[PDB]
């Protein structure tokens, strides 16, 4: 069967590629989580499809579905906000498939590729999407122009230590940083030990956003400080951007210098 | 007069965003550097406007030449490969604005944006794209699927010595790393420094790729690993991706797992 892992953008109509819009007309099934399950649902995509949604809350369950559905035979599309290979469906997807003991059947390398195992095969191919990193950059100005490093604060799977190495790698390399889940429940004190881990590298003063669901409905972009970080309040739909030690705020716009 | 920014994706047609088809299909006038302009024109999608792209070889000057013309009152699309504000357009056409004086005039924060001066004004706006980390990463499988660093070879606008920093960092915190620009002809030696700054923090046989024109004509994806850098050959088209100490080889497919 096909899997097609479908990159939707930050999440309006005009957001997907081509590429997208096509591999979707081609599935005969879509999955993927709820909330972008149905914004393809408001786009008037999902027509004439099998769309399976209910279930699907959980990573693995979503990735364990769609590759029982391709190897089975079925047209699949795996959709993800943003690129699914951006703490998205592709991971997960391969390592299922390695757990399964799917081998390669044309030859190739990389993806697109032929896969089959004792259950069947699976063509596989990753469709990109402009991720949150991108898509928030254009409502900021030119926060990304240098270096960058993008950090998921999600310890779901990964230790806190470690994202606090990461976090303190990335202040001492000064990289423009882009925090991807910021904010959580079990957690919500995260996203302020991160600013006051980058604080030792950088001025107070230094650039930061804060940009809300980017191209959907109450998108909102918040321009502050690193330190001003400390005391904000981040969502599930936010994405956090903090300025090296030269990015500087332009008439509204944040710049990160080219040079 | 209209100012976009105009992200192209990685270079065919079907990787522009419709955003981005939009944005050029309402634009009276095309700026870029020749190979990105005649590549939407081989897509059909410059007939009946202005198309400039002699004399557009330096970044500084296409980005006075597209701010002066909307200045001006014109309807101007300035494109980019991938997205805008990576290593792109985003960053020297701010700088440039900044450099004139000009001054936000509608209250609003981060981009889109209305701007005016002593020349004019202009409507700035900049259109996201898939960037070639996530376009060749999907050609690859998951590599980036945990954090990632991307950092730029170009020793140009950039000293060497911090590019030599942003790796240690980058190793140290056992980032994934993205490499744009990776080989030049003053220095054909850096990617293979590059390299041995990594070697420091990971495995000889750490997985790595260079991918060269993804999603264009002579698309080339080669495997090999962090040690095998070192003899490796980049173009100007070549985007090199190096796996952290998780990363690994899975079938044919780069896998960098999700925890
Ligand atoms: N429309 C949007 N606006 C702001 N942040 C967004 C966003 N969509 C996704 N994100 C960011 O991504 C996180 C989910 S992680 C999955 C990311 C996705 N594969 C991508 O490429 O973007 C969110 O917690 C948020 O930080
Ligand atoms: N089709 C493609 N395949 C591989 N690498 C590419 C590419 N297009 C651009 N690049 C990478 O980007 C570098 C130019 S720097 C400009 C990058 C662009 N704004 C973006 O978002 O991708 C190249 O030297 C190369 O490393």
């Known amino acids: ?65 769609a590759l029982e559905r391709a190897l089975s035979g079925q047209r699949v599309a795996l959709v993800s906000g943003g690129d ?22 044309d030859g190739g390398v990389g993806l697109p590729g032929r896969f089959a195992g004792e259950e069947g095969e699976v063509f596989l191919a990753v469709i990109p999407g402009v991720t949150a990193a991108n898509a928030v950059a254009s409502l900021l100005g030119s926060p990304l122009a240098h270096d960058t490093c993008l950090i998921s604060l999600s310890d779901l799977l990964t230790p806190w230590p470690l994202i ?47 940009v809300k669901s980017a191209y959907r409905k109450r998108q909102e972009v918040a321009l502050t400080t690193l330190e001003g970080l400390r005391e904000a309040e981040a969502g599930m739909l936010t994405t956090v951007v903090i300025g090296n030690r030269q990015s500087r705020f332009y008439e509204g716009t944040f710049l990160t210098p080219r040079g």
Do not use: C
């Open 1 to 65: 069967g096909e899997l097609f892992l479908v990159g939707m953008g930050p999440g309006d109509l005009p957001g997907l590629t081509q590429r997208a819009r096509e591999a979707l007309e081609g599935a005969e099934v879509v999955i993927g989580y709820s909330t972008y399950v149905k914004l393809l649902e408001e786009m008037g995509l999902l027509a004439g499809k099998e769309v399976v949604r209910k279930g699907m809350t959980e990573e693995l369950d979503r990735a364990e579905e």
């Open 84 to 105: 699914p290979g951006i703490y998205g469906m592709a991971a997960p997807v391969l390592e299922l498939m390695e757990e399964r003991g799917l081998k390669r059947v």
């Open 164 to 210: 606090e190495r990461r976090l303190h790698a990335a202040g001492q390399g000064d990289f423009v940083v882009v925090l991807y889940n910021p904010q959580s429940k079990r957690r919500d004190w995260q996203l302020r030990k991160s600013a006051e881990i980058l604080l030792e590298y950088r001025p107070k003063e230094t650039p930061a956003a804060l």
